[PDB]
Design a protein around this ligand. Structure first.
Ligand SMILES: CCCCCCCCCCCCO[C@@H]1O[C@H](CO)[C@@H](O[C@H]2O[C@H](CO)[C@@H](O)[C@H](O)[C@H]2O)[C@H](O)[C@H]1O
Ligand SMILES: CCCCCCCCCCCCO[C@@H]1O[C@H](CO)[C@@H](O[C@H]2O[C@H](CO)[C@@H](O)[C@H](O)[C@H]2O)[C@H](O)[C@H]1O
Lengths: 285, 283
């Protein structure tokens, strides 16, 4: 240690002033360890977006502290550049933030604003391009002549070009076809394992979250409702249902078979796991 | 037959050396009261197709009959078409809005001339259907939540009382309860008003539960047409063309391969539960 992420008693209120003041986060505590894949789920207006903005410094806590790899990022001594070297944040439909004249220039934007020599930038740009799987020959193309998917690659390379070891993605499969969805999730997981990252994935898709995550943070009206492994979390089917969420289809089935007598775990997370339990139970009867 | 599409093609930049065929020889029909799902990979021509159906695009070739009327004839206006077909685009809340909720919902029916006493009825009926309080009528749309804005946008379309309703990915961006709620209301309005509804979606699980018929697109062609069972039995083909089957269908498939008497085209957890319990009570 230090644990790479610790959020210590954080609250946030928009416009703390002020008759516009509106509480969005209340007493948030958690920590995330090395190499953990984390899922954040919760209803619309539960605070997920506000939270992830605390982690990369777009918002400062109204109370409490956030330590990234042992650095209190809430201290005035720590800039929004220092933070970008540790934490990258990919918003939804990040392709709509492409701005620059060429792919190379768009990817370079961040690291050039970070300072960094031209040699540094150029190596980071090409390293990023390779990681997200876009040919080096696209470097001199206009972003606005690329695929939807290609654009989304370029937007994400811009963030990775800063080599953060914490990567936050807000609904990265949004708008994609079903093959697109698996491809981005596979590539996220592959980059996670390869570079020993923390990855934080915010999503309304319970099925994806359940397959990919080591740990899930469940938000509810600005609070942490629950933290646990996907099994632990999706065992609370009745509670999730009441706070705007859901369980994966396959988990609901396991649940429904249990109610009627079948000795299947109620926290089966994947088709493969369900298959294996159901067949094993049949072989045993 | 309320919808008949005959030999339709469409070309982007028809000019022009940048010309691109997006739709090629489309043929199908949709019967009274059918809930139809349209699925297909990104760029397979789904959006282009639906815009043919409400006249926002005209076919390069071929014809489209709505309630017997060739809407591709120059004699048929956009207004005529908007009385029969409503089209709800993705994230319809990011459209601009009029000054108040009432005015925004009233826009379409007021453009229809139409007794303003009857505009008011259409507005308040539409508000009830999409679940927004009558007390929001005077509010400016910017004071509403994203979900509320989406309700208002949809009420504007329903206030026209179309009998064909087309929705492009209506659950987009919503939380899981949101997603179930919009799909329940869509189905409820469908059954109640005897509509045709057309839902374009990348979510195979939703499309499977709700549709009577599915149109599967692939590189600008119809690849297949059939019931959800018929379509999702073609698992290997769907995989090849950018799509997928519902999780529960995959499971059923995988259990059938290993000896379980479960149909490979189970579409819902409920069906899968019944089949599995039957095999246990059966031996
Ligand atoms: C064809 C018919 C047309 C139907 C149109 C209906 C569209 C339905 C849109 C539902 C929008 C999202 O649906 C709902 O949104 C509200 C916020 O606005 C969410 O959020 C709500 O959370 C809780 C419930 O968990 C509320 O007490 C809280 O004030 C609010 O945050 C719900 O958790 C979400 O499920
Ligand atoms: C952490 C880094 C992550 C970066 C990488 C993340 C993005 C990975 C997924 C990119 C999205 C792929 O998304 C999409 O998938 C479908 C599969 O049907 C492709 O496939 C289809 O599209 C085109 C239409 O123009 C057809 O000509 C093509 O034959 C067909 O296969 C789409 O062109 C692609 O845009």
């Amino acid at each position: 240690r230090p644990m790479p992420i610790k959020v210590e008693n954080v609250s946030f209120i928009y416009n703390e002033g002020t008759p516009y003041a509106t509480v969005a986060l209340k007493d948030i505590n958690f920590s995330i360890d090395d190499e953990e894949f984390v899922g954040i789920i919760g209803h619309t207006g539960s605070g997920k977006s506000t939270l992830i903005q605390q982690l990369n410094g777009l918002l400062k806590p109204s109370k409490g502290k956030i330590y990234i790899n042992g650095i209190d990022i809430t201290d005035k001594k720590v800039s929004l550049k220092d933070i970008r070297k540790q934490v990258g944040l990919v918003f939804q439909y990040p392709e709509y933030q492409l701005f620059e004249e060429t792919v190379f220039k768009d990817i370079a934007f961040g690291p050039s604003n970070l300072g960094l020599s031209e040699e540094e930038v150029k190596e980071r740009v090409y390293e990023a391009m390779e990681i997200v799987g876009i040919s080096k020959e696209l470097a001199d193309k206009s972003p606005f002549e690329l695929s939807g998917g290609q654009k989304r690659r370029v937007a994400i390379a811009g963030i990775l070009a800063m080599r953060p070891k914490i990567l936050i993605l807000d609904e990265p499969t949004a708008g994609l076809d079903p093959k697109g969805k698996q491809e981005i999730l596979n590539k996220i997981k592959e980059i996670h394992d390869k570079y020993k990252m923390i990855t934080i994935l915010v999503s309304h898709n319970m099925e994806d979250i359940a397959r990919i995550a080591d740990k899930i943070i469940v938000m509810n009206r600005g609070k942490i409702e629950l933290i646990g492994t996907p099994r632990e979390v999706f065992r609370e089917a009745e509670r999730l249902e009441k706070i705007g969420l859901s369980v994966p289809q396959i988990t609901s089935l396991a649940r429904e078979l249990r109610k009627r007598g079948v000795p299947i775990p109620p926290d089966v997370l994947t088709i493969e796991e369900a298959k294996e339990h159901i067949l094993r139970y049949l072989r045993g009867t």
